[PDB]
Amino acid sequence: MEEFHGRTLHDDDSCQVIPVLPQVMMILIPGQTLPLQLFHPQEVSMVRNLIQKDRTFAVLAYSNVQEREAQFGTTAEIYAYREEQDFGIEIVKVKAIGRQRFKVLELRTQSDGIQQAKVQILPECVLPSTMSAVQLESLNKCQIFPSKPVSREDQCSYKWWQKYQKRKFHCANLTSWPRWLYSLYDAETLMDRIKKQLREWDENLKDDSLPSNPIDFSYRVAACLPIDDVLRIQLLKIGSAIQRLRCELDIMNKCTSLCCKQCQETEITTKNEIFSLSETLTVYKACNLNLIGRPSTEHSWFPGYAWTVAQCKICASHIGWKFTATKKDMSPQKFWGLTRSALLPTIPD
Amino acid sequence: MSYNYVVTAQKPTAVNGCVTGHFTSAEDLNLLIAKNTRLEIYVVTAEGLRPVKEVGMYGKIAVMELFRPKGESKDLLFILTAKYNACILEYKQSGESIDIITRAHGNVQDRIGRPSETGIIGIIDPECRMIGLRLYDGLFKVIPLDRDNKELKAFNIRLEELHVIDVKFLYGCQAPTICFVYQDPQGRHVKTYEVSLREKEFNKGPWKQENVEAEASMVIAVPEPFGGAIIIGQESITYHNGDKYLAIAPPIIKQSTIVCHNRVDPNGSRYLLGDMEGRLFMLLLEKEEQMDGTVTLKDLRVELLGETSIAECLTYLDNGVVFVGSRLGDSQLVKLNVDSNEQGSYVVAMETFTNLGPIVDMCVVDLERQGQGQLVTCSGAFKEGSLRIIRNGIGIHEHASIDLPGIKGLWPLRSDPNRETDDTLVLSFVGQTRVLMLNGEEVEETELMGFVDDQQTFFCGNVAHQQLIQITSASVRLVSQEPKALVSEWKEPQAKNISVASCNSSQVVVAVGRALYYLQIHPQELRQISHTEMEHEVACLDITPGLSPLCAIGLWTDISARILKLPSFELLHKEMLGGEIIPRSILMTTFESSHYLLCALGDGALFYFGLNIETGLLSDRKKVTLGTQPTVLRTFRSLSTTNVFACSDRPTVIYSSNHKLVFSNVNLKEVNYMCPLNSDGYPDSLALANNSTLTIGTIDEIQKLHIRTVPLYESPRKICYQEVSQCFGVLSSRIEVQDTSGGTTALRPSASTQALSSSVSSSKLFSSSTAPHETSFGEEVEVHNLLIIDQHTFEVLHAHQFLQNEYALSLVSCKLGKDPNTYFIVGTAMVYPEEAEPKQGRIVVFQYSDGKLQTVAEKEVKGAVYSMVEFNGKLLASINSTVRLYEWTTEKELRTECNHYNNIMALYLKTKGDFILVGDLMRSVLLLAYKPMEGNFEEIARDFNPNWMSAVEILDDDNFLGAENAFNLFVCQKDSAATTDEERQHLQEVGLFHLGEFVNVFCHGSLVMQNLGETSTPTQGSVLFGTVNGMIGLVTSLSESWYNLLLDMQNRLNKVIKSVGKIEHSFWRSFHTERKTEPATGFIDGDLIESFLDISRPKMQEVVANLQYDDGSGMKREATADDLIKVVEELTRIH
Ligand SMILES: [Zn+2]
Secondary structure: OOOOOOOOOOOOOOOEEEOOOOOOOOOOOOOOOOOEEOOOHHHHHHHHHHHHOEEEEEEEEOEEEEOOOOOOEEEEEEEEEEEEEEEEEEEEEEEEEEEEEEEEEEEEEOOOOOEEEEEEEOOOOOOOOOOOOOOOHHHHOOOOOOOOOOOOOOOOOOOHHHHHHHHHOOOHOOOOOOOHHHHHOOOOHHHHHHHOOOHOOOOOOOHHHOOOOHHHHHHHHHHHHHOOHHHHHHHHHOOEHHHHHHHHHHHHOOOOOOOOOOOOOOEEEEOOOOOOOOOOEOOOOOOEEEEEEEEEEOOOOOEEEEEEEEEOOOOOOOOOOEEEEEOOOOOOOOOEEEEEHHHEOOOOO | OOEEEEEEEEEEOOOOOEEEEOOOOOOOEEEEEEEOOOOEEEEEEOEEEEEEEEOOOOOOOEEEEOOOOOOOOOEEEEEEEEEOEEEEEEEEEEEEEEEEEEEEEEEEOOOOOOOOOOOOEEEEOOOEHHHHHEEEEEEEEEEEEOOOOOOOEEEEEEOOOOOEHHHHHOOOOOOOOOEEEEOOOEEEEEEEEEOOOOOOOEEEOOOOOOOOOOOOOOEOOOOOOOOEEEEEOOEEEEEEEEOOEEEEEEOOOOOOEEEEEEOOOOOOOEEEEEEEEEEEEEEEOOOOOOOOOOOOOOEOOOOEEEEEEOEEEEOOOOOEEEEEOOOOOOOOEEEEEEOOOOOOOOOEEEEEOOOOOOOOOOEEEEOOOOOOOOOEEEOEEEEEEOOOOEEEEEEEEEEEOOOOOOOOOEEEEEEEOOOOOOEEEEOOOOOOOOOEEEEHHHHHHEEOOOOOOOOOOOOOEEOOOEEEEOOOOOOOOEOOOOOOOEEEEEOOOOOOOOOOEEEEEEEEEEEOOOOEEEEEEOOOOOEEEEEEEOOOOEEEEOOOOOOOOEEEEOOOOEEEEEOOOOOOEEEEEEEEOOOOOOOOOOEEEOOOOOOOOEEEEOOOEEEEOOOOOOOOOOOOOOOOEEEOOOOOOOOOOOOOOOOOEEOOOOOEEEEEEEOOOEEEEOOOOOOOEEEEEOOOOOOEEEEOOOOOEEEEEEOOOOOOOOEEEEEEOOEEEEEEEOOOEEEEEEEEEEEEEEEOOEEEEEEOOOOOOOOEOOOOOOOOOOOOOOOOOOOOOOOOEEEEEEEEEOOOOOEEEEEEOOOOEEEEEEEEOOOOOOOOOOEEEEEEEEHHHHHOOOOOEEEEEEEEOOOOEEEEEEEEEEOOOEEEEEEEEEEEEOOOOEEEEEEEEOOEHHHEEEEEEEOOOOEEEEEEOOEEEEOOOOOOOOOEEOOOOOOOOEEEEEOOOOOOOEEEHHHHHHHHEEEOOOOEEEEEEOOOOOOOOOOOOEEEEEEEEEEEOOEEEEEOOOOOOOOOOOOOOOOOEEEEEEEEOEEEEEEEEOHHHHHHHHHHHHHHHHHHHHOOOOOOOHOOOEEOOOOOOOOOEOOOEHHHHHHHHHHEEEEEHOOOOOOOHHHHHOOOHHHHHOOOHHHHHHOOOOO
16 A cells, blocks of 8 residues: 655635545544545546645535535545555545545536535634633642542542642632633543543543543544434534533433444433442333343342343343342342443433 | 723732832832732832832733843843733933833744743843743743843743743852753652853753652742752752752641742841742741851741731832732731731731722622712632722811811911911801810810800901901901901991801902992901992802902892902893702802802702903803702812812812813712811811711822722622612622531631621522532532621621532522512522532522511522523523523512523623623623513524633623633624625624733723713713723723724824833734734723823824814814813713
8 A cells, every 4th residue: 555644734714625525425523534445437536646746635524415515524634545456446445534624615516527625724723721811820830730640549539630620720719700610611621521421331441542632532532422413513513622522521411312232223221210329330220121031149249139131122132131139128129230332322312 | 883992990909920129229129019011119118118100011011020230230120021022121210200211122922832831931040141931831932131132032942841830040150050840740850951142052950850749839049158949849848959958848838838939138048938828937048057168058947927918929128028919819018027926926917008809790889979880899809808899089088076066167267477377267156156276186165356256157267457357147347466356347237137248358248138248358447348239139149359350149039140340339240040049159269270150059059150350251051960958169278279179968079170170079978068277287188067077187189999998708709789678799608628526617707607697598499419429628618608798887787608519609689570679589509529510509589678688489490500680570590501581470489481592501691671692601602682572582693703701791782892811802793784684693793902901790880970961972881890900991982983083093192102111002902812813993092092191292292293183073273282182081081
């Protein structure tokens, strides 16, 4: 293959003319690799010419698939290229990464087959800390915090986060708002909260996996979380990192129906009924589940909790076990200890 | 398209850095204090601070240090601006004129670079070889100091360590070395570099990279012979000098973080240290090891000198006097008599400078005069929060007090050789007239031989021909000066009682009934000169001087003013002044730098008029409403030119500035009669008496805002006014610690633990709740209260404490629905540390009746009620993201009516008519309209622009004003164009301005009286605003022609006026933001325009060299430099 290592970025709030890929139909959030195999001779020649010149293409996120009209889009720079003639077709495989977000100022159809659009690159504005306008001069030296410790011994690092909130927003008492309000507009705090509520759907190591930059982290989270497309356009229209992070929190807190994986169509339970009295997710109530096997209580973690095998109704795959009480005076009577990765939360519509 | 005008009615007060040096003179000890732009230069004297100059700089003073380069007598002053303007100022006075010249000026900004989060650091070589500046991370900008470096040409030097906390230049070194503490993943280190100007790059430092505490806060460079550095954090002070290393962990600095420092000895043996909670330590250096002539440290003892204001910049003046300048408290002057030990504290306060502090909410209230507003602000924070009542009135400083039995008139009588002093004042009692003689402060009343003992004398002045006349109703008695005996008696032919007698320098007129008699004073004799008859009785008469060319009389039967010939009986002019009541005082005054005669009616209203000294009478119809009580206008010599004091229920002082009179309200409840008395006891005084008693004292110059402070020892957050209840309602926060016995303990006796009727909110509408992460020992918890503070004594009448973990946010007093009574509606929010965005809140409706705060209503909402206002009898709440409209039922229970769900957080609610304006911190200004036919909100407009927004206000149905990041002000405007049914949905941004302050609160109203003036004023409306630093502003609109004229005049003044540091005006006022900068538009700087009256007439001439001036015409002459004086004088009255 052919690897390109140079990095270029057009100036923000400026116009540029680029061709539009017709095969692409989804919104390519910047930072997300979107490999594509091109077999149309005109498209292949255009891609080769672009890779020779700039290796920059445009992807238009149409709001309506039938209408194919987009008020916003993205620019993609090719990271790897490999064009080979296989089975009589000059197929070119290109792995590209989004670089900038573009609003379609004017798109017209070129005679070559592709459509050329002149668009102005939207500016991704980055904001200073909310306390920089009012921070006391003497308290400037107290802005740097002694690192970010984290360990299982600290568990939730609760005291550390109170200390951070109390030290960073100390001057919020000069203003009509309280510190817990400014903490709702902090980039670090919102990144921490997104990490925390993403650990409850998967147990990945987020101490290295997720970026430490609000812009990069915001795009990565916008890419990873599973929703429909139109809300992805909505998240794309956002022009600031803080607003994008807040929108992502709103979307994550909007979805509460823990649907199955595999199926991605049935509703196992809801986040409202979480039997947090006593890893695995405990649900006090459940529906649309099939229980089988025998209540084998051997080596049970929970005293007085016998469990049986479970499946959805159709997926027939194990998602957990409905622990049942082994004593008459035991509450809850039946609680489902489902596996975290066996469910994919979706918007409860 | 907006045409605003922004002015400042109170300069900023929050001190953000002070420094002492020999600045004004080679021997003086100065003290320079910067506020934002107000560089105040004081000279330290024995008693305290004597102000010397106060210069307004075109920027926010972010760096200020006095240095003396080799070869100079007095120090210079390097000042850096938050917009990166660097200037080197020098003091220059020529006998009487004082000027701050600029020896070098430049802009030290970089094209690119993220500004350092720890902020600008500006440090100077002790040998004055360079100036180091940290502006952006990983870059140290060095400014060489040369006589030919007039542009301050600086160069960068890369720093290998990005996270630099504090950096300083060391003492006793050959090459300029810097030492600094920096943060790396390993921890916190201290590193030293050497700086060479030739090579223009760092070198090897004298020391080695050491390791310090994980929270080592700040560095302090110790002078010779100690040398080295001291690094202090939160639990240890460590002194490093290469091979030497001392470390101390005292058990007294554990409670708080040292934040400020200063040096009290020239040889650096003792240092002053102040922390966040306002406590003053003292670091003592022990040099007991003089082993080889040199001095080395042995011990590092830390004392504790007591407690002061919450310090921000200490400074040790001479003789144990410290200026504890406070940013959120109030600047002090504490005396460190370290041998006092009165109660363990070695500090005793001396002075206290007013500091309006972090204004967090204000309200305009018509408290007393019922005509002019009074601002009430929740100032300060933590242990020094207070309420400030700000009023616009000419202040009277009373120095003497005395009790009189309802005296209704006094007059100074001199019975001694002329020495500009009167040893006695005759007071008019009901039936008699007892004259009190006071060589010192005596109160005994002594009867004069030449004055009638018990006759109720009316006029007793300083007659001519070395005589004293005591004219009464019975007879006029003239006594001599040296004989001091009755030498003349002028009895009327009918022996009747004269109602009102007019007295002059040598001519005396007595009016009895409808007849009048004029007489001339003669040496030791009284001679009647003429007699005359009038159509109606003479209620009042007074001829103002010599011989008066005219005499003014008020007709008792017609209530008309007639001016005639005083030494004759020939009438000149007459005018029926309304006729509502008989006038009670008519006089002619020269206070207008001309001849003018105004008369006061019995109802207090005065009809202005303009007299002629030689011959001629005019009308000049103009009404001034002093009040609703009879007024006896007088004049006092201790004045600018003459002044005119009108004593009434609302006393006023009338003074002319340029061509129009100004009636400034006095700072007294009510005065019945006043008289000047420039006696030995109180020189330049004015003795005033009321219905209660009498007093004497001096009067301030004019219209200075007076601020009354009411301490609370808490943090006040909000304030409203309930008119019917005659009381205020203020939310406040008190910080408490977690107690070992289970519960919370207060640090100090606040203003909520010391209320009359203290209640506790028990309406636990919910129960249970969760807190798995329970609070531990030593944690700080905020407890909120609603205080009901009075309007006269300013005492807390009730302190209703809310639930636990409940932050009470908003507060409104209104008459909901159709109820005849008012309520205090408070919206709260249950906040627990585990939860991030609160989920539970309340809207609790109190009603303060009969001294008890009874909770009338109750309501639980699924969110936090951020803001609340009132529609026409319907509450309008903002719960998290939704805007809800509550209708108050008859059963006394708030009932929901309609909802409007937003994608933004409804955080700023401001309404007028039916237009609602909703905003949040990200400047998502949004508009809504209430449709009565449907009952649901319709979104009319929208404005989204990511940026930190601080406040918002409605100016009109069209203009919406607001504050914005980097201390800017903006103004949006709706409608116009109406092109494609989508432009009306958008808010055009028309006005931009760089105010230079962080606005907290916007509120309508104004602090001037409501004299209508028929034609009104060009400025329409008035919006006060209050900022963190403590200034009160004022935004008022303007007509388009006025805006064009004042913008052209602003452009013309920019070329004539000279700034300090030579910062061009248009760059100071450009809309500044970290990413883009655009010129100001739609805003007129009120300060610059009002500075047009300070420049000289020769300088005023070329300001108006070729202009139009309009004024119902074209381009008449060139405004003649007097039309614009009229314009600016009119513009000055607004604030
Ligand atoms: Zn399933």
